[PDB]
Design a protein around this ligand. Structure first.
Ligand SMILES: [Sr+2]
Ligand SMILES: [Sr+2]
Ligand SMILES: [Sr+2]
Lengths: 254, 253
């Protein structure tokens, strides 16, 4: 009852923190997608241009604490990247068939959660179409990672995780709960979801919960198996993360 | 117990504050090198500043900034998100604001103050706009903290944030604002008031009796009331990451 009321307040904060973290990164493609020096680098991809966009993105990503920010031309090729001096530079890479690229071309913008193709680091890929004359010029992408939010949550003493509308856990204070589910999926649409996540190894098995008893709260009690130690008893509350289509759930130990 | 958990909750408050602050820092960061903003400063014309007025207006809304504004090389504001308001900053002279001058010197500045007309406190976050051999201007976003404060109200554990002289800048209990936590001085009482643009400073101490330290770092404490009485409270302290601010939280027994 009052564990329930205290857990509601706690889950609401965690949701505002996450909202604040996302919104920091959102502003950068919002602004970059209309920038005449980004457009001109895509209308005339000379080596002087692209070096400046390279340093522009490099310095922007560093102060923004964005994993990568990069610019993709109309054929899917990354022409500029914040990580241009790193062995792991994205410059030259082909992302023509990436969701974040393809849906930004089609819709104007997209936000997509997936594992990095070489990094194996999960994150939100936030993308915007760069509009030109007579058509699209390319896409600007910022990848956000959530390691600092996940550490804040794990220090809270109340495990928390975020699901999409498919029920898949994307962000979690318990690492091995990532890509576990709130509902049984699986078998026929494991392939398409693993493809979507860029992660063949996504377990996509239900979260280790049982003895679920709903309350008139809208909250529920629950026995979970912890990444071992054993099983413990919890109160689960949920809340929407505002300005997202994401759902935060939080467990409080009984 | 309550000490452990009060530290957890205090870190979370500080962490929500850092993230809200960082969200706004991103605004002058992307804008400072914005080609339209640069263009408007090199070659100011009428359609180009209208586009900047409207652009900064839409950003202030999406970014949840109180105000976003562009200042020229001289210190005069040339565009603002509040440009349709009778309170428009366009035409004001900010040449002597720390956020203007320190941004020209360092590339970057932040300063917490009361607004000149608005008497509303906030963090002014600024960045130099660079041109071919020289500064072209400064972009400023003002951040105000009502949503962070309203978030701290729902907690049930009151909290306030101090600068390194001990002055309360941000509080879940609105009457405690600009009250003091540290002993101050004399030759510093006017320097601080001009700095905050708050001419009639308290610097009253917070209403605390019988302060009792723990091996924690924490503190036992008797405090009343903006409305209400005395209460025993546990106090904890954490530094706000990515800032030079300090947070304090009061936990009822
Ligand atoms: Sr979302
Ligand atoms: Sr000043
Ligand atoms: Sr600060």
């Amino acid at each position: 009852a009052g564990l329930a009321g205290q857990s509601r307040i706690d889950a609401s904060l965690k949701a505002s923190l996450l909202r604040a973290v996302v919104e920091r990164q959102r502003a950068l493609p919002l602004v970059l997608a209309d920038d005449a020096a980004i457009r001109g680098a895509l209308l005339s991809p000379d080596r002087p241009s692209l070096d400046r966009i390279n340093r522009k993105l490099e310095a922007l990503a560093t102060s923004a604490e964005a994993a990568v920010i990069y610019l993709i031309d109309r054929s899917g090729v990354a022409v500029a990247a914040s990580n241009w001096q790193e062995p792991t530079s994205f410059v030259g890479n082909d992302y023509a068939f990436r969701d974040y690229f393809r849906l930004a071309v089609r819709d104007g913008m997209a936000e997509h959660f997936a594992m990095g193709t070489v990094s194996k680091r999960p994150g939100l890929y936030i993308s915007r179409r760069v509009d030109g004359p007579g058509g699209p010029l390319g896409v600007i992408v910022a990848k956000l990672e959530f390691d600092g939010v996940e550490a804040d949550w794990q220090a809270s003493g109340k495990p928390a995780y975020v699901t999409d509308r498919r029920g898949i856990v994307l962000i979690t204070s318990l690492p091995s709960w990532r890509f576990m589910t709130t509902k049984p999926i699986a078998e026929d649409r494991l392939a398409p979801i693993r493809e979507s996540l860029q992660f063949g190894d996504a377990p996509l098995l239900p979260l280790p919960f049982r003895k679920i008893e709903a309350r008139p709260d809208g909250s529920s009690t629950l026995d979970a198996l912890l990444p071992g130690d054993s099983t413990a008893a919890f109160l689960r509350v949920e809340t929407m993360v505002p300005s997202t289509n994401w759902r935060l759930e939080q467990l409080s130990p009984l």
